[PDB]
UniProtKB/Swiss-Prot annotation:
This is Polymerase acidic protein. It comes from the Viruses. The lineage of its organism: Viruses, Riboviria, Orthornavirae, Negarnaviricota, Polyploviricotina. The chain holds residues 1 to 196 of 716 of the full protein. It is found in: Host cytoplasm; Host nucleus. It comes from Influenza A virus (strain A/Vietnam/1203/2004 H5N1). Influenza RNA polymerase is composed of three subunits: PB1, PB2 and PA. Interacts (via C-terminus) with PB1 (via N-terminus). Belongs to the influenza viruses PA family.
Length: 179
């Protein structure tokens, strides 16, 4: 799985995924399912940002924690939008809201509720994708056009297929539960 990850995702995503694990005291070599999952989440966040008009999104995810909070703080101080209790992934300048992005091997609605109860924010928008082509977003507002979301759905399905083809998919799907 380690070598699958390093050949499936681009080096920039891989490097950001390694840094992110280390800061939480995780070894990518050992926790390889976590490694794949972090890379997937990052790739989705970057695809999503790319789905809007050029300036639409401020990207929060992928940054160093301290700098991430600084940017969040600048958005909050300048738009009046409420400060989130946890780091979201993007800020949407068009809709004026933070967005938390999820990618789950479980049911979209389950993960959605877990994320929503954790954040406890009326303002923040939540948008969950699965590896089975499903999505669920706050108030059924999917932010992006259908073509942009469909590209993300396709990519996740290809990741699932590439994993199953190497016998890694069962382990990956189950691992989110075991956590
Ligand atoms: Mn995040
Ligand atoms: Mn997220």
């Amino acid at each position: 799985m380690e070598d699958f990850v390093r050949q499936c995702f681009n080096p920039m995503i891989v490097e950001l995924a390694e840094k992110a694990m280390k800061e939480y005291g995780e070894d990518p070599k050992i926790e390889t399912n976590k490694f794949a999952a972090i890379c997937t989440h990052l790739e989705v966040c970057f695809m999503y940002s790319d789905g809007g008009s050029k300036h639409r999104f401020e990207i929060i995810e992928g940054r160093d924690r301290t700098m991430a909070w600084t940017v969040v703080n600048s958005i909050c101080n300048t738009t009046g939008v409420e400060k989130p209790k946890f780091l979201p992934d993007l800020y949407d300048y068009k809709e004026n809201r933070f967005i938390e992005i999820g990618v789950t091997r479980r049911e979209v609605h389950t993960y959605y509720l877990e994320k929503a109860n954790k954040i406890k924010s009326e303002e923040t928008h939540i948008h969950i994708f699965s590896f089975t082509g499903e999505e669920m977003a706050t108030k059924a507002d999917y932010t992006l056009d259908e073509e942009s979301r469909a590209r993300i759905k396709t990519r996740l399905f290809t990741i699932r297929q590439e994993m199953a083809s190497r016998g890694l998919w069962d382990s990956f799907r189950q691992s989110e539960r075991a956590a």
